[PDB]
Design a protein around this ligand. Structure first.
Ligand SMILES: [Zn+2]
Length: 387
């Protein structure tokens, strides 16, 4: 078949929602497991599957047998595999603060460690650009605030730690870096003092980001990352809005449901909201202490005909939304594509073949089968490559 309806895996990670995939899309969950991520892709730990005679096969294996035809020549020669993983993320609790090192440092790091597996910081030599697209209202942290915004926010907690007073005396990148590292390094009486000053300020300071710190504290009451919302932008994405997660930039997913597209990597440097050991020097060497103003956080999409593209400054993946109507629209690309029904209902057509996708269902389109025609109602999301 030209168009392959996908059988996708659900990761039942303990932080997942017991209800989100079921309320949104009707996915069955009779035993009320946590359903943390719905995977659409070719990840070796749990590849999506396709149906051929009626047998299913791994999308990863099917791609391995026919790379050029499935991926297109450009992706096949550049990546040698499907270069992205596409997920529905439904976090019932707030998740960890993370940083992804850039390509060059990821390669330096991976080969620094390879001499000594797999506590290693670099699981591979790849960067991990990501884009998050809100399906429900989505609370996140992303990137450093403007310095004068941090100054504002730290006044009420100046007493918490001498690193805060040091930053406020001279609020620059160097002292922000020292602060970030000193916060995450706090121990014993020092951390306890700091958290008790923060606790108190939560009683006297109303609104954001204090509210977000209260929300985090439910799940991470003894964590030095409780200070992070004072340093990092707290953003509430409305459904339909998106943000790109740059290298060397701390971020966290705190509440709600999103689509996420990522490059293939597992280099995650944790930066708080975790019980795991944090290598602070490595972390700091891979963080860009440069403010990102609020106005610059969301990705500005561009609408052309029925297509809303989200420009991504990397080659690893591209992402677009397609409005559906009665009249067919042609969806084409030089690469493999995964098409996901966000809402409404999509009828995909390739020559004689027709494939219906309801909300939350997806299809794989191999490079050789582009373009396909889409009609119906609502919207389809596409992950593809523009190379
Ligand atoms: Zn990330």
């Amino acid at each position: 078949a030209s168009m392959q309806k996908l059988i996708n895996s659900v990761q039942n990670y303990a932080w997942g929602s017991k209800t989100a995939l079921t309320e949104l899309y009707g996915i069955a969950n009779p035993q009320q497991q946590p359903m943390a991520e719905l995977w659409m892709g070719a990840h070796p730990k749990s590849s999506s599957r396709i149906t051929t005679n009626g047998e299913t096969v791994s999308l990863r294996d099917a791609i391995e047998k026919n790379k050029t035809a499935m991926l297109g020549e450009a992706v096949a020669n550049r990546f040698g595999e499907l270069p992205f993983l596409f997920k529905v993320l439904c976090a019932a609790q707030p998740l960890s603060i993370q940083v992804h090192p850039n390509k060059r440092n990821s390669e330096i790091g991976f080969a620094k460690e390879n001499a000594a597996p797999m506590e290693r910081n670099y699981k591979d030599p790849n960067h991990k650009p990501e884009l998050v697209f809100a399906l429900t209202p989505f609370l996140a942290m992303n990137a450093f605030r403007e310095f004068s915004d941090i100054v504002s926010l730290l006044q009420p907690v100046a007493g918490a730690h001498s690193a805060i007073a040091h930053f406020l005396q001279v609020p620059n990148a160097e002292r922000l870096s020292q602060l970030f590292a000193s916060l995450l390094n706090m121990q014993g009486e020092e951390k306890s003092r700091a958290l008790a000053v923060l606790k108190a300020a939560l009683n006297s300071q109303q609104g954001e980001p204090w509210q977000t710190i209260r929300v985090i504290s439910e799940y991470y009451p003894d964590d030095s990352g409780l200070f992070s919302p004072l340093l990092l932008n707290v953003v509430k994405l409305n459904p339909g809005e998106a943000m790109f997660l740059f290298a060397e930039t701390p971020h966290a997913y705190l509440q709600g449901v999103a689509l996420e597209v990522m490059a293939n990597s597992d280099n995650v440097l944790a930066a708080g909201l975790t019980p795991k050991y944090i290598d602070i020097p490595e972390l700091v060497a891979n963080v860009k202490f440069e403010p990102k103003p609020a106005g610059e956080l969301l990705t500005a999409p561009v609408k052309s005909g029925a297509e809303l593209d989200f420009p991504i400054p990397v080659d690893d993946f591209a992402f677009s939304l397609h409005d559906l109507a009665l009249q067919e629209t042609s969806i084409g690309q030089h690469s493999a594509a995964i098409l996901f029904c966000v809402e409404g209902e999509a009828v995909l057509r390739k020559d004689e073949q027709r494939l219906v996708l309801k909300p939350g269902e997806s299809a794989f389109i191999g490079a050789d089968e582009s373009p396909v025609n889409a009609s119906g109602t609502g919207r389809l999301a596409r992950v593809y490559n523009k190379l």
